């Protein structure tokens, strides 16, 4: 089992480059640093190579998140949008492979934001999402990449809110490299039981995100870490566990993740590192790895 | 400590009137039935008197919730909107008094929906809200009504997300009849601790809402009910405990509360009643009353 | 899944008879009343016939526990004690049959008290225990009786303290009518996880005892009842769930069960009955049945 | 808040000397090493000055526990035993001061084991214990020593089983240097709530022991550590937090602590040290200080 952290923990804007974080995160002891795919599509093939070398030199693995947009996604009713989404995924996946990244996760079946002031078509988005994912799976598979479908809370997605729903979706896709992805923040809202949701995912659990209910680093709160740890071991999970803390107000991240109040305790960079380092140790000790 | 339920548990549309529920809820054993104030604003004085007498004959108390709109609220930057909001509250409060109601709760300091696709002025909304609420407190007090400010999760409000922030808001208002209101659904997301949040509200807790993390009735899930009951007793809470379950998809309620999947187990009305009845007994036994 | 209560809940002395409790417990709503098998050995045939008739007329089932003494335990290294133990069991099993009882539980593999100020031979007691139980299994089986081996905390037994140890023992016994029996009071001390223990027991769980960590009735405390119910349902448990609360100090029960302070809140009989009734409803709603 | 460990974690016999552990434990990062006070009575003043220096040199503090015996304790009905207890305590306290020890804890009001096969006198033992402790308090105070009365579970003590009982006893003693001492292993059995017990102790909490329900090091199990940490901070606890794990079978320790099965995972010394080092980091992060 490997542990990582989403580098945006230290930023206020999604536009901040992850390059310098490779070395920093490795120095803090993490096995993995999770990055945002969109950033990757803007680097030159020479820059990607430099980034891949930095990761190799620092002995750290890269994992990536992908957030489709309203104009480029696989679930839209608009065929043009679906075609652009498929084109967007193929391009991103090719670039992702250039960084030796083999795990891609996120709401791949949908997009963000999602105007909930406008009527929603659950059955339709589900059916189109299944088809769209099925259609890019082989391309990802040729690159040795697993696509991990993230189950989200009701406020962020209306199709997959439960591990059981996530598993049904994945079975419908019917591809060996499409997996379910769970996140403690989202499970905290929707699931009946953390252990049960993890066991339900079982062999299909391909990626895992952690954070307290209000998104502080693991160990600062009341999440049932021991129960979670036991469930992950019950299913012999040997994948990645990425902490995705968001404790800073301001900027695009602050408003997008809706971090209205500071939850860092006015931490300077050194305190932010310390919390990350302690959460890492806590996670390895209580969860495994 | 008295127990009640929000009548919309049995409906799919907010427009469904509450009149017929007075007796139904009383017979299920509840001490209280919580209703929507906007319906009270539509009933005629004769109809309100009928409702009032019905509550009396059935030995049940009524409590109400107010949901200000972006056009009539107390926190708007727009002076005209703030004035419209004040008039709305005074009119509403006068009508609420006709039904012998003494507790009004909700996001009285702001409104709903609230478009988060646009910039937000947290500090200004907070300050205008404090002055706005201070400005209607005596009018409410003259009618013997307590105004309970509901603390909400980040996806629904950006001003008060924590019991501590709620307490600070209430102290800033400085009115004896203005109280803090907490809700297990919202606390489940934002609070470091349920017991600590309740103890923090302390003497200022004037209303309380319950439900599991995904909103089914109390006792169906993993919520720390024992810890909650203990804290409520710790602060000698003798107010109302209203379960606010939302387990049915469809209609304006289903989309507004984002109930994307059924959480009632396909229950018919008779089963809905049974869940409420069992949750009531469970609440009385674990929490108090 | 059926619910019952150990009748000594209302007494101070083990010597108190259960006969009068058959009807009392049935009217409180329980499916089962657990009794001490040694009391059965003291009634005449006519009395046993009356009791059996009483249980059927009141629509309630009897289940019973066995508590071997140091003079008649199957684990003794003294061959004569083992022989006495075997005779004790045969006589007790034959008497239990006269009451149409099909479930017998307890530390059948050992005895009580047990002087831990004297040397312990765990390996030996285990081996003789397996032998002895295997040795009476068929006699019990011919009477339609299941023997359920209770896993206890370290202060009461030194051989079987965990569900896993209980399972290994039952497997060594190798008899279809010999099962594992778990108790929340004991699991709370020894187990890593309530859910995993129940799951480890799986198909072999033949009897179940409940109570809070300090032995109050279910629902009065912090036990993870939601987790326990989910686990019991996971293994499709349809056996009995017996609440075994001990909240009264004084008398032999108080000193034997070590109830050194009153845990009933100074309850009169009406309150004791009410608590039992509330715990029963709580258990059915949260655990099942 | 300072963190320590009881050195017997690494042994099988109570007679093993703690000398070599002062430096071992300090190098592991602990602020404190707790030892058994009776051992201190065996050293010459010279050996004691050497131990005191080793502690100062290694920058570690010493804390000690006392377990009175059946023949020398403060609660016995027999006046000769009470005189023996007082004399033994005064002698030990004088010796303890030579190692600059300022905290002495344990079942100071009683003794161990306590034969429960014999009748017990709660009210009498309580009264005599209060008198006995009150009687040596000034002597300990003149040496700068706080006497911390440990609340134990029902199987080990019959006088003080809950924080509230401990508080009543300490208030009856009426001495500033006599405090309540809580242990998570004991609280796990007897307390209605971990957080409520700690708050109840409040300003009177003078020492604290940690371990999982089955005595593994902190962080290995289901104990509500986040809730405990919150409570310790609510009362501004600035005392010591000593982990008291017993995971090894065999020897006098194994039988006295009733460690009937290995809970160390067959750990060699390095693995035992690692578990301790990891529990220490877990405790500083989750409990505080």
What DSSP assignment string belongs to B263-274?
-SSS--HHHHHH
When CB atoms are compared, the residue of C219, C222, C285 closest to B278 is C285
**Shortest distance, CA C233 to any CA of chain B (angstroms):** 14
Q: Parallel, antiparallel, or unpaired for β B240-243 and B2-6?
A: parallel
Task: Find chain C residues with C-beta within 8 A of B282's C-beta.
Answer: 281-282, 285-286
Q: What tokens were used for A153? A: 């809370």
Beta-ladder partners of B223: none
Residue bearing tokens 């684990």: C75
D219 part of contact set with chain A, CB < 8 Å: yes
Q: Single out the catalytic residue among A34, A191, A212, A244.
A: A244
Rounded to a whole number of angstroms, the CA Rg of chain C reads: 18
Q: Phi, psi (5° rounding) for residue D5? A: -145, 140
DSSP for chain D reads -EEEEEGGGG-S-TTS-STTHHHHHHHTT-SEEEEEHHHHTTS-HHHHHHHHHHHHHTT-EEEEE---BTTB-SS-SSHHHHHHHHHHHHHHHHHHHTTT--EEEESTTS-SS--TTS---HHHHHHHHHHHHHHHHHHHHHTT-EEEEE---TTT-SS--SHHHHHHHHHHHT-TTEEEEEEHHHHHHH-S-HHHHHHHHGGGEEEEEE--TTSPPTTSS---HHHHHHHHHHTT--SEEEE------SHHHHHHTT--S--SSS--HHHHHHHHHHHHHHHHHHT--
Distance CA B223, CA D119 (A): 43
Tell whether D193 lies on the interface with B, counting CB pairs under 8 A. Answer: yes
CB pairs under 8 A between A and D: 25
Q: Positive or negative CA dihedral for C134, C139, C141, C147?
A: negative
Q: Which residues of A touch C193 (CB under 8 A)?
A: 226-227, 230
* Total number of residues shown for chain B: 289
What distance in Å separates the CA atoms of residue A104 and residue A90, rounded to the nearest whole number?
12
Cα angle, residue D204 at apex, residues D200 and D205 outer, rounded to 5°? 80
**Cβ of residue C155 closer than 8 Å to a chain D Cβ:** yes
Q: Is residue A80 within 8 Å of A38, Cβ to Cβ?
A: no
C259·D154 Cβ contact <8 A: yes
Quickly list DSSP for chain C.
Answer: -EEEEEGGGG-S-TTS-STTHHHHHHHTT-SEEEEEHHHHTTS-HHHHHHHHHHHHHTT-EEEEE----TTS-TT-SSHHHHHHHHHHHHHHHHHHHTTT--EEEE-TTS-SS--TTS---HHHHHHHHHHHHHHHHHHHHHTT-EEEEE---TTT-SS--SHHHHHHHHHHHT-TTEEEEEEHHHHHHH-S-HHHHHHHHGGGEEEEEE--TTSPPTTSS---HHHHHHHHHHTT--SEEEE------SHHHHHHTT--S--SSS--HHHHHHHHHHHHHHHHHHT--
**What is the total count of domains within chain C?**
1
CA distances from B247 to A26, A189, B276 (A): 45, 14, 12
User: Longest C-alpha distance within chain D, in Å?
Assistant: 50
Query: What are the two backbone dihedrals, phi and then psi, of residue C182, each rounded to the nearest 5 degrees?
Result: -115, 160
Segment C199-204 long-range contacts (CB within 8 Å, at least 24 positions apart): C199/C231, C199/C234, C199/C235, C200/C163, C200/C164, C200/C167, C201/C163, C201/C166, C201/C167, C201/C235, C202/C167, C202/C235, C203/C235, C204/C167, C204/C170, C204/C171, C204/C179, C204/C180
| C-alpha to C-alpha distance for B118 and D141, rounded to whole angstroms | 65
Tokens 């448990």 belong to which residue?
C237
**Helices within chain A (DSSP H only):** 19-27, 37-40, 45-57, 79-98, 122-142, 163-173, 184-190, 194-201, 225-234, 251-256, 269-287
| Residue A55 near residue A40 (C-beta atoms within 8 A) | no
Q: Which DSSP symbol is given to A203?
A: G
Residue D284: Cβ-neighbour burial (10 angstroms; 0-12, 13-18, 19+): middle
Residue D262 CA to residue B283 CA, distance in Å, equals 42
Which of A90, A31, A94 is CA-nearest to residue A63?
Answer: A31
Query: Is B244 annotated in the active site?
Result: yes
Chains that touch C (3 or more CB pairs under 8 A): A, B, D
Nearest Cα neighbor of A198 from A160, A151, A153, A158 is A151
Q: How far away is chain D from the Cα of B190, in angstroms, using its nearest Cα?
A: 16
Instruction: Classify B66 as helix, strand or coil.
Output: coil
How many residues belong to chain C? 289
- Kindly tell me the sign of the dihedral angle through the C-alpha atoms of A38, A44, A45, A49: negative
* Interchain contact C113–D (C-beta under 8 A): yes
How many C-beta atoms surround the C-beta of residue A242 within 10 A?
A: 25
SS3 B110: coil
User: What is the C-alpha separation between B250 and A213, in angstroms, rounded?
Assistant: 28
The catalytic residue among B11, B34, B150, B191 is: B150
Residue in chain D nearest B193 by alpha carbon: D227
Q: How far apart are CA B288 and CA B228, in angstroms?
A: 10
Quick check: D64 and D148 in contact, CB under 8 A? no
Pairs of residues, one from chain C and one from chain D, whose beta carbons lie less than 8 Å apart: 65
Give the domain CATH number at A82: 3.20.20.150
Which residues, listed in sequence order, are joined to residue C148 by a DSSP beta bridge?
C105, C179
Q: D211, D205, D181, D240: which is closest to D2 by C-alpha?
A: D240
Residues in chain A: 289
Q: Are A221 and B192 an interchain contact pair (Cβ–Cβ within 8 Å)?
A: yes
Number of A–C residue contacts, CB under 8 Å: 16
Helix axis angle, B225-234 relative to D194-201, nearest 10°?
Answer: 30
Q: Is the CB of residue D278 less than 8 Å away from at least one CB of chain A?
A: yes
DSSP H or E segment with residue B195: helix B194-201
Name the packing angle between helices A163-173 and A122-142 (round to 10°). 60
**CA–CA separation, B182 vs B74, rounded Å?**
20
Phi and psi dihedrals of D63, rounded to 5?
-130, 155
B286 in C contact zone (CB under 8 Å): yes
The alpha carbon torsion through C95, C97, C101, C106 (nearest 10 deg) reads 50
In C, which residues are within 8 Å of B286 by CB distance? 219, 282
Q: Report the C-alpha gap between B246 and B254 in whole angstroms.
A: 8
Identify the burial level of A45 via C-beta atoms within 10 angstroms of its C-beta, where 0-12 means exposed, 13-18 middle and 19 or more buried. Answer: exposed
Q: How far is residue C212's CA from residue D66's CA, in Å, rounded to a whole number?
A: 31
**Residue B100 lies in domain:** 2-289
Nearest to B205 by CA among B213, B215, B194, B216: B194
C13 included as an active-site residue: no
Which of A219, A221, A226 is nearest residue D221 as measured by Cβ atoms?
A226
Contact of B218 with chain C, judged by CB distance below 8 Å, is answered with no
Query: Alpha-carbon distance C14 to C6, whole Å?
Result: 11
**Residue from B166, B172, B75 nearest B124 by CA:** B75
- Residues on chain D touching C117 (C-beta within 8 angstroms): 113, 115
Query: Are the C-beta atoms of A187 and B187 separated by less than 8 Å?
Result: no
Q: Do A195 and C192 touch (CB under 8 A)?
A: no
Tell me B112's DSSP state. Answer: S
Task: Please report which helix (H) or strand (E) contains residue A206, including its range.
Answer: strand A205-210
Q: Give, in order, the Cα–Cα distances in Å from C48 to each of A219, C45, C52, C59.
A: 59, 5, 6, 17
Residues in A touching C191 (Cβ below 8 Å) = none
**B80 and A CB contact within 8 Å:** no
Question: What H or E segment, with its residue span, contains residue A105?
Answer: strand A103-106
Chain B partners (3+ C-beta pairs within 8 A): A, C, D
Contact B22, B54 (CB under 8 A): yes
CB-nearest partner of C193 from A192, A193, A230: A230
Q: Of C33, C60, C29, which Cα lies nearest the Cα of C277?
A: C29
Q: Does B58 contact A at CB distance below 8 Å?
A: no
Residue A21: how many CA atoms within 13 Å on its side-chain side?
22
Q: Is B255 on the interface with A (CB under 8 A)?
A: yes
User: Is-contact B242 B63, C-beta < 8 A?
Assistant: yes
The Cα C18–Cα A284 span in angstroms is 53
Would you call the peptide bond into D113 cis, given omega within 30 degrees of 0 as the criterion? Answer: yes
Instruction: Tell me the nearest-neighbour CA distance from C126 into chain D, angstroms.
Output: 12
Instruction: With beta carbons less than 8 A apart as the criterion, state whether D83 and D72 touch.
Output: no
| Cβ neighbours of C194 in A, within 8 Å | none
How far is the CA of A62 from the CAs of A30, A37, A176, in angstroms? 11, 11, 21
How far is CA B189 from each of CA A193, A279, B224, D133, D172, rounded to the nearest angstrom?
Answer: 15, 20, 13, 48, 44
Of C247, C233, C240, C178, nearest to C209 (Cα)? C240
| Residues in B touching D196 (Cβ below 8 Å) | 230, 234
Name the residue of chain D whose CA is nearest to C216's CA: D192
Q: Residue D58 and residue C131: Cα distance in Å, rounded?
A: 55
Which tokens go with D126? Answer: 């309580």
| Residue of A196, A226, A234 with shortest CB distance to C230 | A196
Provide the token pair at C153.
Answer: 């905390």
Closest partner CB to B282 (pick from C221, C222, C282): C282
Tell me the C-alpha distance between A91 and A83, whole Å: 12
What's the length of chain D? 289
């Amino acid at each position: 089992m490997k542990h990582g952290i989403y580098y945006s923990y230290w930023e206020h804007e999604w536009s901040a480059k992850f390059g310098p974080y490779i070395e920093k995160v490795a120095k803090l002891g993490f096995d993995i640093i999770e990055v945002a795919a969109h950033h990757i599509n803007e680097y030159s093939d020479a820059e990607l190579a430099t980034i891949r070398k930095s990761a190799k030199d620092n002995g750290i693995i890269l994992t990536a998140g992908i957030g489709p947009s309203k104009t480029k996604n696989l679930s839209s009713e608009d065929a043009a949008v679906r075609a652009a989404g498929k084109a967007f995924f193929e391009r991103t996946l090719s670039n992702v492979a250039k960084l030796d990244i083999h795990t891609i996760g996120g709401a791949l079946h949908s997009y963000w934001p999602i105007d909930y002031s406008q009527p929603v078509d659950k059955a339709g988005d589900y059916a189109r999402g299944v088809e769209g994912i099925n259609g890019i799976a082989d391309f990802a598979n040729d690159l040795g990449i697993n696509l991990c479908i993230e189950v989200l809370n009701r406020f962020e997605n209306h199709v997959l809110n439960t591990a059981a729903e996530g598993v049904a979706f994945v079975k419908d896709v019917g591809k060996n490299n499409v997996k379910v992805m769970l996140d403690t923040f989202h499970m905290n809202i929707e699931e009946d039981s953390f252990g049960d949701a993890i066991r339900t995912a079982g062999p299909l659990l391909g990626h895992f995100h952690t954070g307290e209910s209000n998104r502080r680093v693991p160990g600062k709160g009341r999440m049932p870490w021991h129960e979670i740890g036991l469930a992950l071991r019950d299913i012999n999970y040997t994948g990645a566990v990425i902490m995705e803390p968001f404790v800073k107000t301001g900027g695009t991240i602050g408003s997008d993740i809706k971090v209205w109040r500071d939850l860092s305790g006015g931490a300077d960079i050194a305190k932010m590192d310390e919390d990350a380092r302690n959460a890492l140790a806590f996670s390895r000790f209580v969860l495994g790895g």
